[PDB]
Amino acid sequence: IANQPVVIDNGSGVIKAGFAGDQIPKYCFPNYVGRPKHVRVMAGALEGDIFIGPKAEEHRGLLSIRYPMEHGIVKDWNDMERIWQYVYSKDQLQTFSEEHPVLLTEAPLNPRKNRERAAEVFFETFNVPALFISMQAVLSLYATGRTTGVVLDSGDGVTHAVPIYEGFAMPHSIMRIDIAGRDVSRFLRLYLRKEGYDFHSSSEFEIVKAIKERACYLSINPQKDETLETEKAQYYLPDGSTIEIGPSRFRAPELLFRPDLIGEESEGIHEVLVFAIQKSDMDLRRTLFSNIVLSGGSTLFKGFGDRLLSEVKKLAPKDVKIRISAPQERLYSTWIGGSILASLDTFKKMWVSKKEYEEDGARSIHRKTF
Amino acid sequence: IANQPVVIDNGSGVIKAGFAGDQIPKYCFPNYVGRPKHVRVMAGALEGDIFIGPKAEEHRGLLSIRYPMEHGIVKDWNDMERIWQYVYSKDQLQTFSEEHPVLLTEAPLNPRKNRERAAEVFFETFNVPALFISMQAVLSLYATGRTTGVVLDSGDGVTHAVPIYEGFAMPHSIMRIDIAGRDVSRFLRLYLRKEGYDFHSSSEFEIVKAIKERACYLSINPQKDETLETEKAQYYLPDGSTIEIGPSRFRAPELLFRPDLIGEESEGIHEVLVFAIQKSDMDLRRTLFSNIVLSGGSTLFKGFGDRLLSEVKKLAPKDVKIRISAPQERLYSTWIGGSILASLDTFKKMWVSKKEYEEDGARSIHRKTF
Amino acid sequence: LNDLLSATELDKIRQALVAIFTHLRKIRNTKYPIQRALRLVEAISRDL
Amino acid sequence: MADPKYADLPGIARNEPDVYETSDLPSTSVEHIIVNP
Numbered sequence A, B: 001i002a003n004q005p006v007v008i009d010n011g012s013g014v015i016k017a018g019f020a021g022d023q024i025p026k027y028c029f030p031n032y033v034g035r036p037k038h039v040r041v042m043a044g045a046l047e048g049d050i051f052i053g054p055k056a057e058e059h060r061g062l063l064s065i066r067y068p069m070e071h072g073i074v075k076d077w078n079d080m081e082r083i084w085q086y087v088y089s090k091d092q093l094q095t096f097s098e099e100h101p102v103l104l105t106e107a108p109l110n111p112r113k114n115r116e117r118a119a120e121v122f123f124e125t126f127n128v129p130a131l132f133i134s135m136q137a138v139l140s141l142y143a144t145g146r147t148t149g150v151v152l153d154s155g156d157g158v159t160h161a162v163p164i165y166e167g168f169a170m171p172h173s174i175m176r177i178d179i180a181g182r183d184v185s186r187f188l189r190l191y192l193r194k195e196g197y198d199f200h201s202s203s204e205f206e207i208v209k210a211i212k213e214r215a216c217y218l219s220i221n222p223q224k225d226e227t228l229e230t231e232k233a234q235y236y237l238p239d240g241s242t243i244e245i246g247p248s249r250f251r252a253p254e255l256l257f258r259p260d261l262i263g264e265e266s267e268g269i270h271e272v273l274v275f276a277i278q279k280s281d282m283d284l285r286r287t288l289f290s291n292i293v294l295s296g297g298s299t300l301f302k303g304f305g306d307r308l309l310s311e312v313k314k315l316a317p318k319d320v321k322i323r324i325s326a327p328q329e330r331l332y333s334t335w336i337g338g339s340i341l342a343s344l345d346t347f348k349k350m351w352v353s354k355k356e357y358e359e360d361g362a363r364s365i366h367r368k369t370f
Numbered sequence C: 001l002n003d004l005l006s007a008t009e010l011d012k013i014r015q016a017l018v019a020i021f022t023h024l025r026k027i028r029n030t031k032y033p034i035q036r037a038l039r040l041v042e043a044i045s046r047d048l
Numbered sequence D: 001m002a003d004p005k006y007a008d009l010p011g012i013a014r015n016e017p018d019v020y021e022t023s024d025l026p027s028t029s030v031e032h033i034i035v036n037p
């Protein structure tokens, strides 16, 4: 026995949510809380001091933004409860919580303590009847409806590649990199001070993030493309100010393939990705050549998959046809896939009742992990 | 008490006062000192040797004028005592110094010693049930009904602009120039002897005030009006004589925009206010372009507004719509806002027991004002 | 509380109090005054 | 209103506008196939 569950597609930057069997996440709001810088002695103005969404984005000025979650590992768990309480807002739910099944998201390569504390929240502070969350890549595959695939997510500062054969991942061939657009914008901030500009405020930095997402693409041959002169079509701020560009429009996003240039013993998404592919079956790579699942919204770049095709030619196999799946609802793919799963009578076997948590809890977490 | 606390428009040039709920500061008078200039010998003359009221500003040639306020800050506390006695006159109150709470006004960026000194007098001389003093800027928006906005006052003590975001003040962004119309009158006296006009007396000074507020005006064009061939209109003196005018009628208020001509280093009220805008957030300034509030008696000029608008036009950012208010009562409105504040039951923190002041002192009030 | 309002015998009464206690578990989700909570504790003691 | 209030004191923006203003002015295509033969 249950109610209609809700799929909460936790984007590393923007969390999303929405009831079962639907097509579009009901809510789409980010992951940070602002608190006012200035206080007042005046009587009659606003209250709250904790805002997320249009309230925060509305009056960004005093609300000092702080991202509580880092690579899934959140440190403001209490504030996450407040965030989920905000998910239970009047404008948000007006529903109950201890009487409905739900669905959140889970990326791999994580400490169990996160799931442990999560169960503590939803089953100590809440009394959720049944709830089970699994690997996000399968949800993307649900959106595809394709047995095998190479899913690559793209969070704000989180990325990971997973190959799955008919609903079976490869634990010995799954990789992850701790970065996405987060340090890309931070690196753009670096470029800003490289040519003398600081955008040290939190909101200011998110504005920089929006600028990045607004004007950035991929180049063909980076060192050869460096030989030209960027004309820097200046954009003009909401404040009304000159915005130069530099190589940032193409150089800054390729930091992903130059972690040594940023200071990290890593190689590249496609590099370690194809390495894990090499660790897979001699035969399944053939399937994965056409089964290339693109996911995550950080992927929005001109010639993104095209430069990725160039990367494929860099890591060329022994002449075998390859194909990439590049949909348009890559962020929504996981939410919709969960909605598909949430629209299944198979969750009876795929769930864990709260009574099970009452009986064991931690042991149910360890044993009934997946 | 169940009645009206003492509302005092602590005015720089002209101090006014009245009570809560009322919309008329019942008593208005400048911040001068009226003692005599001669010695009565005849038995049956007028006496008192300390005069306020119209009789004081009647026999100017017989009454020594001594303005006790300096930059909006008095230093002649004895005169303030006598002033408050005149405030307590039968023509005014017939009350006690304990029957009602006292509300006074101020300007920021002042020594706390003033507040100290003040309360010391207010409780050693009076036994006030509750005393409170604050910024008229809050009261100003109360009069406009707004929440945010920047207000620049132009009194004869200090001209200062305050940016306001719903009362959440930005102490690092407030500007305060210590100029007055008094200096413009002095400057006019300079023009007098330039034009050959023998004036040095304190009595003449008020006549110059009448000239200032009546014969002077504002020339919108800065240097185009500087080269205008004057006609030297003649003002018929109240005693019965007549004196020419010249281009000085608009030259003198431009010193407020070019203080360096007198030697005072500043940047002009307009630019100073723009710098205050510059000491803030980015897109919140966009609101302030619409949020423009005028204040102060030293604003009533023929040509004032539009000239100041042109100043703003030169100080304008890149193509941003700007709205500029202009209240009628650029002074009285503050008193009325104080009457509104006094009409509040939420005046809890503001009402302070005298015993509490005995226990701590002005520091206790500093905690409230800070 | 309607269970105690219609309480009949030891088994039903006791188990009703058990269910009452399980509903009393909402303090972690309410933050109600400790003293008022104690008032409720002895109130239930009087009711019992 | 404050009309008699305005009759009492003289500080009213008489015959003057109270508002001044700066006037008006006038995709992810899929099938990135690396056909390697």
Ligand SMILES: Nc1ncnc2c1ncn2[C@@H]1O[C@H](COP(=O)(O)OP(=O)(O)O)[C@@H](O)[C@H]1O
Pocket: A010, A011, A012, A013, A014, A015, A153, A154, A155, A156, A157, A158, A180, A181, A212, A213, A214, A295, A296, A297, A298, A299, A300, A301, A331
């Ligand atoms: N124009 C754009 N170019 C690149 N990335 C973008 C653009 N617009 C939005 N994004 C990205 O969409 C991504 C959504 O990330 P997130 O919701 O954290 O993904 P995930 O669901 O994989 O965690 C963000 O990382 C943000 O940088």
Ligand SMILES: Nc1ncnc2c1ncn2[C@@H]1O[C@H](COP(=O)(O)OP(=O)(O)O)[C@@H](O)[C@H]1O
Pocket: B010, B011, B012, B013, B014, B015, B154, B155, B156, B157, B180, B181, B182, B212, B213, B214, B296, B297, B298, B299, B300, B301, B331
């Ligand atoms: N009609 C007027 N025209 C120009 N200036 C005026 C007029 N009336 C008052 N003022 C100016 O107001 C100043 C008096 O300070 P004021 O504005 O009264 O501050 P407060 O009300 O705090 O005393 C004087 O410098 C005087 O020139």
